[PDB]
Every structure is written in C-alpha cells, then in structure tokens.
Amino acid sequence: DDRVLVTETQVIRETLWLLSGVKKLFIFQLIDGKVTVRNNIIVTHLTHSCLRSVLEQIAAYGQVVFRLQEFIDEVMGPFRTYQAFMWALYKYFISFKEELAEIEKCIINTTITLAIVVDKLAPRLSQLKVLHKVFSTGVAETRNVVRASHLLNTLYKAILEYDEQTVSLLFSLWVETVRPYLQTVDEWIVHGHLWDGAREFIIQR
Amino acid sequence: ITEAALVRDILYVFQGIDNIKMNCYKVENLSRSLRDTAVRLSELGWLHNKIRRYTDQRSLDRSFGLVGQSFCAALHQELREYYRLLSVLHSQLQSLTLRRLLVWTYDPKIRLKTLAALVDHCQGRKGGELASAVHAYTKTGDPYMRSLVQHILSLVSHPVLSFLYRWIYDGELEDTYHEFFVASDP
Amino acid sequence: AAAAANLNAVRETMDVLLEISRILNDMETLSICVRLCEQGNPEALSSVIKELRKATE
Amino acid sequence: SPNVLLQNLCCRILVAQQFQYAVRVIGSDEFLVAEKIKKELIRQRREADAALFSELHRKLHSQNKWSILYLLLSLS
C-alpha cells in the first residue's frame, strides 16, 4: 500500500485551514457534508495509525465549523431574526479566526508541533463544543413564527443551565439575537402600531 | 555470553524485571569471575521488589490510616531518587563494566537496606503506633542512617501533630480511624 | 555542512563541561583550559591556576 | 601555539613576571578519576549531585577526557 508521506509542519497549516472553515483541502476531504481524513497520510513517526487517530478528533471539530459555515452561506448567497442571529455567529468567527491566523505567523517566522497547538487552543475547542449543542436545536426545526420562537427560547434556557467565559459567550450571543423583538416591542409602544414582517412576531394579527 | 549482555540485564534486575531470573536472583555458559559479582549486584533488586510491594499492598486498602499512609507516601520520594540514578546509568550503557557499577551502586545498597528493613519492623502498626516505631530507628548513631530516618520521621509525624494542634486549640477531634491517643465515647 | 556539524558538537561538549564545573564548583577561562589540556601535566596546570588566583587576591 | 594559549590564560586570570613563572612551571585512568570525584562528592555531602555527575560523564563520552576531569577535580 502506497502513502503520500507528508511532512510535519504541513499538517498544522492544513489543520488551521480546517479551523478557518475553508474547503477543498488535501487533507480532511469531505464527501457528503462530513469531513473525513484521507487514507495515505503518514509521517516518519506515529506509525500511520495514531495520525489517523489524532486527525480524527480534529475532524470532529471541523464538522462543527463546516456546518456553521454552511449555515451562514445559506443566508448570504426578510426574516430579521436568523439574519440577526448569524451576525452574532459571524462576529464570533472573525475574532476566533484572528487567533488561528496569528498562530500561522509564528510558523513562518520557535519550535511548533502537534501537541502544542492543540493545548494552546483548549479555551477555543471548549467554547466551540457548546455551539454544536446550542445550534443543534436551532437546526432540527416550518412556519416562520415557530422556527424563531423555539430558537430564541433555547438560548434563555441554555444559559440558566450554565449559571467564567462560557457564560460571556452565550450572553453576548443572546443580545444580538433578541435585538429584533426588542425593536418591534418598542416600536409598537411609542409609534402605536405593530410593524412586523412575514408575521415574525408571536401576535399574528 | 559477553560482559555487555550481563550489564544489559542487571540494569533491569535493579527494578524487579528479570539470563538473570528470580529468593536470590539465580543466574543461569559464563566464567565464575562473572556469576559471583552478578549475584552480589542483583541483591539490590531483591531489596527493591520487597519495598515496592509493601508500599503497593498498603496503597490498596484504606485501613492503614492517616499516619500509616503518610509513612507509605514518604517511601516514594525516596524511590523517585532511585528511579533517576538508573536513568543516568542507562545512558552510559550505549562505557561501564561490573567493576565500575560497584563504585556506582555502593551507596544505594545502604539506603535500600535501611528502607527494606524499616518496613519490616513496622508491619502491623496502624496509627500513631507507626510513628512510634519509625522513631525507634533513630537511636542508631550511624551519621548516614540517623540523618535519613530522622527525615521520614519528620513526614510521618506531621499528621500526628495535625490532630494535636486541633485537639488543643479547638477541641474538635475527628478521626474515623482510631489513631489519636484521645478516644471519645458517644 | 560537515564543518557546521563539527561546530555544533564542540558547542554541545562545552555546555556539558560547564555543567560539570558548576556541580564541582568562567566559560572563557574553561575554553582556554580545555584547549591547553588537549595539547598535553594536568597537575602542573592546576598548580599554576591556583598560584595565579592567589596573586589576583 | 601552546605558549600563546598559556599567555592568554594568564591575561584572563589577571604580569610579565607572572607569565615567566607560569612558563617555568610548565617546563617543570578516566574511571579512577570518576571514582575519585564521586568520593569527593560523598565527603562534601550531595548524593543527588553525584548521580547527576555520572549521567553528565556518559553524555560527554557520547558527544584527553581524563586530563580535563583531573583539572576540574583539583579546583574542587
């Protein structure tokens, strides 16, 4: 059986791209919306199997970030809530991307190997696992008023479960998703009329 | 059977892992001028297997108590030291011979002869009665032993002086296992 | 390439020698002593070093 | 070469009279040395340092030697 025998540093660069959410990578070739490690990858060490083990874990993280990127894509290419929800998600990704991008700088310009970049990314791979469970309830579902109510209610329930850095994320993710309702509620009060779109509000007049 | 092979196995008999097999480590050829020094050098393992088993057997049940455990724990900081010396010796096998090894392991045949005879004098001692049977090894005079055991006593007698400073300033004795010499009646 | 490898080996040997000196206890003085020792005796060199230290005091 | 090295060593230690005395003095196994060093360490004790020294000696061989060790032992 033949193998490609990739070098060592090349893997970390590829892993960073998987974290970034980019597709079409020589490693982690997805097939059906499910990232999956290749079969001919081997390093001088690590006996060709531990590599399939360590990559398999990071792959599980790629799924969490690839699916979210697929979600943001299906909104860009007037719900006023999902569109207001992704802007919170999108805002989190830019800052998260900066930490991953910064690491790439210290690679081209100190020794760096696998077991170091992972432990350096512990407080991120932790925060990311939460989103795989918070968003799972925002994707498993047809009317526009039940898809937005059941989503916004899942956050306020999931925060009371976590009552620190994980709470600061969900809270900063909450405010930027309840911004639509707080607007129309105020707009209904002072301007004396309910100005809704697609009957998004729960009061279907 | 070269001399480099025996040094290859001896560095493992110093731990318990067996040409040299397992009470003396009877070796099973080679010249008589080699078997004798091997039998002599391996005597350090039989002192090492016995001390490790004692700490292990007692590190299984919680019946030993707070004072006992402390003494058992004190037998590991005096074993990490014995696990380090082997690493430096191991790096030179790639030169040292049996004669060189004798001048190397002449001192840790004594520390592994007080500790391997300190865990037999206190076998069934649970509680303060243990901290009183590792103090009956300080009346020895030997400046190398009286300055080793008088350190294990400074660790074993720390839990005892933890109840005492509790049963004096606060009067709240608490020991599910009966160790302190002040026994309460419900 | 080969010259670079030789330089790395010399640097590693010097670092190991310095650690041994610290345990039995500068680097520039040790390098000069090592070169003299390699050429050729050892007891005589030690006596000269001790005398020089006494003169400095 | 050796004379120049001796002059450099004298300069580092510190003049001409001292150099002349050093020249006059100049004009005037390994296992055993290691054992002697271990014994000296034991007298100083301590035990942990002796174990480290044995590891260090092996490293030097992995990367003449007797003469360097004797000079270090004399300094003590």
Place this chain on the structure above:
Amino acid sequence: MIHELLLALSGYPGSIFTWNKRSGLQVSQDFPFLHPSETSVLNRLCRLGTDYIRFTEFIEQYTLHGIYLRAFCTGLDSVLQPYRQALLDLEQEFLGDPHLSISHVNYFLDQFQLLFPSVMVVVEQIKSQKIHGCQILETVYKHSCGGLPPVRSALEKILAVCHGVMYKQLSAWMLHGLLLDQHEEFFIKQFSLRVEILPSY
C-alpha cells in the same frame, strides 16, 4: 517512538499501543527493534494512561445529573492540568539531546504515578452508587482527610471550587428569597429543611 509514546499518554492509541475497552492501554507484543525487557516498564507506564483516558471520557460524557456533578468535572480538569503541562515538557527535553531513553521519560511522570490511583476510586464511588445532589460535598470530603500530601492538596482544590456552587446558591437565597434550583440539589425544598442530603461537617 518517543513522540509516539507521548501521544499514547495523551489519549490517542495506535498500532504499537493498542486500546481495549475493558483492560486499558497496553503494549501489543514483542518488538524486534526495542529490547524485550522494556515491554514491562511501558505496561507500568500505561497504568497511568488508562487513568487519563477513563478520566477524559467521563469528563466529556458528564455522566446522573445535577450542577454539583457539572462543577465536579469542571474542577476535575483543573487538578488534571499539571499532568498535561508536564507532558508537553518531555517533548522539549527530547528535542534538545537525542540520547534520552524511556528510563528518563518514566522517571519524569513520578508524581502523576502516585496521584491518579488514589483519585481513581473517588470517581468509581460516584458512578457506582448514584451519588446525586450535594452529597458529593461529603463523599469528596471523606477522602480529603487522606495521608498522602499530594492527594490532600488535590481534592482540597476540587472542594474549593465545588463550594463555589453552594456559595452561589446560598447567597442567592439568603438575600433574594428564592432558590435557583430545578433538580432538588440544595438542601431546602412554606418551605422546609432537608437532612438526608445535608453535608456532614
């Protein structure tokens, strides 16, 4: 093989270090390149890896429910931090000089080898007796009076963070009249008091 091992001690098993669901980490069989006497020390070394894997698998699984179980695992990673950090170091020392053998690597663990074993049965008592509620703040405390100094200094940390939950709830009740609870955890349930769940000390 060194960097191969330092991953096996991290939670990633491979061909050299097979994984079994019942026994734990262990070496497959004899290897020609290495000596036949090392096949033992590794097995002595894996008795540590099995602990970290069975730790992190439980930590992730979160399994039983209740905040006091969530916080226990939250704290359980803190005591487990020096283990990871001391493992990253081993690679750096091996990157410098290429003359270090498994003996030195085995020697470096030293403290972790005598700590995990005593902090293994504390987890086993939980998953085998359904210790629900604040009763954890005693089951961990009854083992905090152990003799081993390292342990006495480990569990005390976990009890120091597990108290943060009670201290959160206790202050939330003693000044706001309400008790933030939905699983009957705190020892109060016209209110009443609870004794069958109240702490020991």
Place this chain on the structure above:
Amino acid sequence: EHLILVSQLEQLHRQGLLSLQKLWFYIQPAMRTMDILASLATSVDKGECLGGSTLSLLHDRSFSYTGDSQAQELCLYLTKAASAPYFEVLEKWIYRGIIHDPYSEFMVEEHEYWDQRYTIVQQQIPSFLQKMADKIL
C-alpha cells in the same frame, strides 16, 4: 575507599598497563591500612570490650604509634569517631542529671541514703578520663 582502589587498576588493566610487578607497588598503602583494621578487629574480640573498655583500647593503640604518622592519623580517625556516642551521653550527665545509656555501658549507673544511688563502674572508664573519674560523678 578500598573498593575504589580496586576499580582504578581494573580500568588501567583494560589497557594492558598493569603487570604483576606493577601491582605489588600500587597496593603498598592498602596493605598497611588493612593491617591496622585487622589488628583492632582482633584486639576488640580477644577481650570482650563494649562501652568504655573499647575506648581505652583505641587510646592505647593510638599512643603505641606515636612516631609512625601513617598509622596514627588512622587510629586517631577511629577514636575520634568511636567516641562521639559515648560523649553525647556525657553531655547529658554533666549539663543535666538524666542518664539514658540504654545498654549498660556508661561509667555511671543509677539504682533504686544517696551513696548507693549512683555508683562509679570501674570497668567502663575510658582510661583517659581516669584523672577526672570523680568530678564526673
């Protein structure tokens, strides 16, 4: 220190530099030291000595070598080391009244109106405290 003087020759022998005639020179000091320790170890067992009488012997076997200076710097290392335990109970009997002496070896033993309580024992006198055998008690 004799188990080391066997090691250096071994290392030298691995090089062929140790002829039999060369051995008969290097061991000359190790043949004279091991001939003092093999004479105290037979003059301590001849007459059973323990306590003081095994400290009188090490003060006379050190005066008989008053001009050797190679076997007096030795017997003065044994006496200076085989008398610290005896001198650590003496520092408890002069500066305080307590006499520990678990084994019956000290010069003064207690009993159970006061001329019979503490009695000087005649055997266990170090023969260099003989001048002050009274001011101690």
Place this chain on the structure above:
Amino acid sequence: VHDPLLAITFELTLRSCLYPHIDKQYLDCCG
C-alpha cells in the same frame, strides 16, 4: 437602554432590572 444596564445573579435577577424600562413606559401610556 438594555445594553447600558449591563454597564452599571445573571439573567434571572439581572433580567429583573430590564422591566423597569418597559413598565414605567407602559405606566405613562395607560395613564
């Protein structure tokens, strides 16, 4: 108004300070 409230016990009692913005406004309208 809710965001400045964050500047000057999380999301349950903290959320119980948002309503004074929505209640006083109501009191004026009905009044």
